[PDB]
Write a protein that binds this ligand. Structure first.
Ligand SMILES: CSc1ccccc1CC(=O)N1CC(O)C1
Ligand SMILES: [Zn+2]
Length: 140
């Protein structure tokens, strides 16, 4: 589990969105595994606007933050899970790092701010849904 709280937005994995998220929906995209809902309180996270390929992510199944090198956002075939059949996921970045299904939502961050959230993984890989191209998260 986990979310990004920026401005009056809450960014979560679409497959973990709650009824309150769907009832306060701003934007969702199944191919990216992302959903954004509106919040009453202002959040403290800031989004990175960069092309970093090194950062740190939080892994709840280890209660630890790990440094990682990650790929650029791309269209990758992701195996079937409890939440989606096997399909192509867009804006996804891969790294070598531990992950389990419930690690989805952990933040990946670089020197500039939040880069994305854990979305996929297995066998010593972890994939992150990028949010750096969603410029509208910084306004309204
Ligand atoms: C960190 S996810 C993970 C990790 C290890 C093993 C399996 C998973 C589940 C997974 O691939 N998915 C949830 C959906 O969005 C795609
Ligand atoms: Zn950066």
């Amino acid at each position: 589990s986990g979310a990004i709280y920026v401005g009056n937005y809450r960014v979560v994995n679409r497959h973990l969105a709650t009824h309150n998220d769907w009832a306060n929906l701003v934007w969702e995209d199944s191919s990216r595994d992302l959903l954004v809902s509106s919040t009453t309180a202002q959040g403290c996270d800031t989004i990175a606007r960069c092309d970093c390929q090194t950062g740190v992510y939080y892994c709840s199944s280890r209660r630890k933050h790990y440094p990682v090198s990650f790929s650029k956002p791309s269209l990758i075939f992701v195996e079937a899970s409890e939440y989606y059949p096997a399909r192509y996921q867009s804006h996804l970045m891969l790294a070598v790092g531990h992950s389990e299904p419930g690690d989805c939502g952990g933040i990946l961050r670089c020197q500039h701010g939040v880069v994305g959230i854990v979305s996929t993984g297995g066998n010593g890989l972890v994939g992150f849904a990028d949010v750096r191209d969603l410029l509208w998260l910084d306004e309204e």
